């Protein structure tokens, strides 16, 4: 208790477990981040907002 | 201290002062809430989301 918080920068804090997703076919990332790379060396966002 | 928090239902809490707005010409409220009333007896949203 107390030492179990998970804080994003402006939103309600969670506590003691969550999930994180690392998918490879989000449109905004296709457009900007990933132009010269492939499905084995890619770059993705962990923020879903 | 401690007894000064302001809590919305899913967002970061504020502390010790804020503002609240009561305007009368928001589109969504024009459409739904206010159809049979006027500018002197009106109905508005305090949530801006």
UniProtKB/TrEMBL annotation, chains A, B:
It is found in: Virion; Host nucleus. It comes from the Viruses. Induction: Expressed in the late phase of the viral replicative cycle. All late proteins expressed from the major late promoter are produced by alternative splicing and alternative polyadenylation of the same gene giving rise to non-overlapping ORFs. A leader sequence is present in the N-terminus of all these mRNAs and is recognized by the viral shutoff protein to provide expression although conventional translation via ribosome scanning from the cap has been shut off in the host cell. Belongs to the adenoviridae penton family. Interacts with the fiber protein (via N-terminal tail region). Interacts with the capsid vertex protein; this interaction binds the penton base to neighboring peripentonal hexons. Major capsid protein that self-associates to form penton base pentamers, each in the shape of a pentagon, situated at the 12 vertices of the pseudo T=25 capsid. Involved in virus secondary attachment to host cell after initial attachment by the fiber protein, and in endocytosis of virions. As the virus enters the host cell, penton proteins are shed concomitant with virion acidification in the endosome. This is Penton protein. The lineage of its organism: Viruses, Varidnaviria, Bamfordvirae, Preplasmiviricota, Polisuviricotina. The chain holds residues 50 to 98 of 544 of the full protein.
């Amino acid at each position: 208790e107390g030492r179990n918080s998970i804080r994003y920068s402006e939103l309600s804090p969670l506590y003691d477990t969550t999930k994180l997703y690392l998918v490879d076919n989000k449109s905004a990332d296709i457009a900007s981040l990933n132009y010269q790379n492939d499905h084995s060396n890619f770059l993705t966002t962990v923020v879903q907002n």
